[PDB]
Amino acid sequence: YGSWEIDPKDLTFLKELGTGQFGVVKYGKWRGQYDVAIKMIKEGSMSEDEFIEEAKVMMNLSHEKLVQLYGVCTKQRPIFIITEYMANGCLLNYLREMRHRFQTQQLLEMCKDVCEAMEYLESKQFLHRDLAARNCLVNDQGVVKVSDFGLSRYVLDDEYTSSGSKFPVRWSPPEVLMYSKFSSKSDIWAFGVLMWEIYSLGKMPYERFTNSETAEHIAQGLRLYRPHLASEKVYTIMYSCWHEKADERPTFKILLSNILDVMDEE
Ligand SMILES: CN(c1ncnc2[nH]ccc12)[C@@H]1CCCCN(C(=O)CNc2cc(Cl)cc(Cl)c2)C1
């Protein structure tokens, strides 16, 4: 076993967490003690040799607000990815549970959580490439962490690969939709949409539009507008992520400073 390789015999499987496009995720314990999520990759869904090679590099990414990679199990099929367990599940579902009766202070904290993780990724020149509420998780303390960062690079499903009937049109800037120009600034754009999702309690962005109409709306320079729960200062931050010119969008370090400033002002 290399440093990136976990012995699957050290795993105890405890509960089903869901079955989806990329495979089956279970809750379990490593060496009888430590909570993990065990992601069992659906056969045929991933460029597996590339994914395994990249998993070695990503063992070196670690941040409090980034879902922690513990290792992979590649000596058998399906391959497993072993990651941090996030007891409250997908952020999108969490936002849509109206019982939580969130305060806007909690919503801003969720944005700060994500922004800190993305600032760390940016400091490593690492792109998420599909940042959205559906790719964040929530732990038992209500902390939001960023999940599946970079994963889209190894997804074989062509409907998801290109501006594709499963492509994240609603989280993409004009230069991605027009030219496939991915950069730090397309992560910045997606983060602004993510803030919008949070302050909209999990509403679909451009709710009344198809993907095709959304791209046209963007093409004409039009935008999402202010969620009822977002203050003017919060809206200014998410809106700054959507400048038509990628180079005029902020960095995650600047977004983080802006978010902290608004938290102090409340
Ligand atoms: C309910 N969830 C969790 N709950 C609790 N703890 C957790 N840690 C990690 C995930 C997690 C996830 C909710 C998000 C949607 C589904 N999901 C995923 O992890 C999807 N991504 C994925 C799946 C596979 Cl099988 C393989 C690959 Cl490469 C990627 C499970």
Distances (CA, A) of 96 to 131, 182, 198, 204, 230: 18, 29, 9, 11, 16
Q: Could you tell me whether strands 34-41 and 69-73 are parallel, antiparallel, or unpaired per DSSP bridges?
A: unpaired
Residue 15 host element (H or E): strand 11-20
Preceding omega of 250 cis (within 30 degrees of 0): no
Residue in this structure with the two tokens 């395994």, named with its chain if needed: 52
Cα–Cα dist 160/258, whole Å: 33
CA of 149 to the centre of ligand 1 (A): 12
How many CB atoms sit inside 10 A of residue 218's CB? 23
CB of 20 shorter than 6 A to ligand 1 = yes
List the Cα angle 255/167/235 in 5-degree steps: 25
Residue in this structure with the two tokens 């941040």, named with its chain if needed: 63
Residue 154 CA: nearest ligand 1 atom is 28
Is there a contact between 95 and 198 (Cβ–Cβ < 8 Å)? yes
Q: Which CATH superfamily is domain 89-265 in?
A: Transferase(Phosphotransferase) domain 1 (1.10.510.10)
- Of 131, 113, 135, the residue nearest 171 (C-alpha): 131
Residue 91 host element (H or E): helix 91-96
Is there a contact between 205 and 171 (Cβ–Cβ < 8 Å)? yes
Local structure of 120: helix, strand or coil: helix
Long-range contacts of 257-262 (CB under 8 A, 24+ apart): 259/108, 259/111, 259/112, 259/115, 260/112, 262/108, 262/231, 262/233, 262/234, 262/237
Supply 154's token pair.
Answer: 């190894």
Cα–Cα dist 194/189, whole Å: 9
Distances (CA, A) of 79 to 39, 75, 160: 8, 7, 21
List the Cα angle 153/156/160 in 5-degree steps: 75
Partners of residue 165 on adjacent β-strands: none
Local structure of 82: helix, strand or coil: strand
Residue 51 CA: nearest ligand 1 atom is 28
Q: Which residues are identified as catalytic?
A: 130
Experimental determination approach used: X-ray
CA of 71 to the centre of ligand 1 (A): 15
Cα–Cα dist 52/154, whole Å: 10
Cα–Cα dist 84/252, whole Å: 24
CB of 132 shorter than 6 A to ligand 1 = no
